[PDB]
Design a protein around this ligand. Structure first.
Ligand SMILES: NC(=O)C1=CN([C@@H]2O[C@H](COP(=O)(O)OP(=O)(O)OC[C@H]3O[C@@H](n4cnc5c(N)ncnc54)[C@H](OP(=O)(O)O)[C@@H]3O)[C@@H](O)[C@H]2O)C=CC1
Ligand SMILES: Nc1nc(N)c2c(Cl)c(N)ccc2n1
Length: 192
């Protein structure tokens, strides 16, 4: 696959854009996990699938019994890996672009984390869209976080919900979803 458009998908707590703590997500938002699953799995073309790219630490954080993520091509990046097709669902690679050379019959490509991957790949011009779940809490400072997004948002434009809807197709997008003390909304951003 040559120069595909790539999307980053992440959930962050405003205003600092915290995304983790000691290797885990600092929240368990049931509806959000379901949205992640649907957006990253659904395709429109016929015999295609989407590809999810992640850092080695992220891969290792998924219980072995629950990986690879089903119904998607999984690509794991490590600076120590040789470009290798493990099986039909798993690819090992040392760079995003090399990994993409190994794929065919992929519709969309998503970067799913973690922090290091995100903070590095945001500056790669292959990244054309950001799907950011913006999470709000009454006392954000009470949530322990050690990992944050460092995205140059001044170079990106948040699109209206209509554009997000068009992006996701059929997926139901509820507004101001509440789960415990968290309130969240899905958003789409494109480069200026
Ligand atoms: N809020 C959210 O939506 C999400 C949050 N996260 C959070 O992220 C955190 C984990 O992030 P982090 O620890 O940084 O882990 P990552 O998943 O980003 O893995 C980092 C590893 O990826 C490899 N890697 C990193 N950059 C590159 C590169 N540019 N090219 C090739 N390989 C590269 C390296 O592997 P090697 O060392 O083998 O070279 C590095 O050690 C947790 O807190 C987790 O909860 C994760 C996903 C979503
Ligand atoms: N928005 C969004 N983005 C991710 N990358 C997510 C991941 Cl990897 C897990 N595991 C769960 C929810 C997510 N939610």
């Amino acid at each position: 696959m040559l120069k595909p458009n790539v999307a980053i998908i992440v959930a962050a707590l405003k205003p600092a854009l915290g995304i983790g703590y000691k290797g885990k997500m600092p929240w368990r938002l049931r509806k959000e996990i379901r949205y992640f699953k649907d957006v990253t799995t659904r395709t429109t073309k016929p015999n295609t699938r989407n590809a999810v790219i992640m850092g080695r630490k992220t891969w290792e954080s998924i219980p072995q019994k629950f990986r690879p993520l089903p119904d998607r091509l999984n690509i794991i990046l490590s600076r120590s890996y040789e470009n290798e097709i493990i099986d039909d669902n798993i690819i090992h690679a040392s760079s995003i672009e090399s990994s993409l050379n190994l794929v065919s019959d992929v519709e969309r490509v998503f970067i799913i984390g973690g922090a290091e991957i995100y903070n590095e790949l945001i500056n790669n011009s292959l990244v054309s869209h950001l799907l950011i779940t913006e999470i709000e809490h009454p006392s954000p400072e009470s949530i322990e976080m050690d990992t944050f997004l460092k995205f140059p948002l001044e170079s990106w434009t948040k699109q209206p919900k209509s554009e997000l809807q068009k992006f996701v197709g059929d997926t139901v997008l509820e507004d101001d979803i509440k789960e415990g003390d968290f309130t969240y909304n899905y958003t789409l951003w494109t480069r200026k």
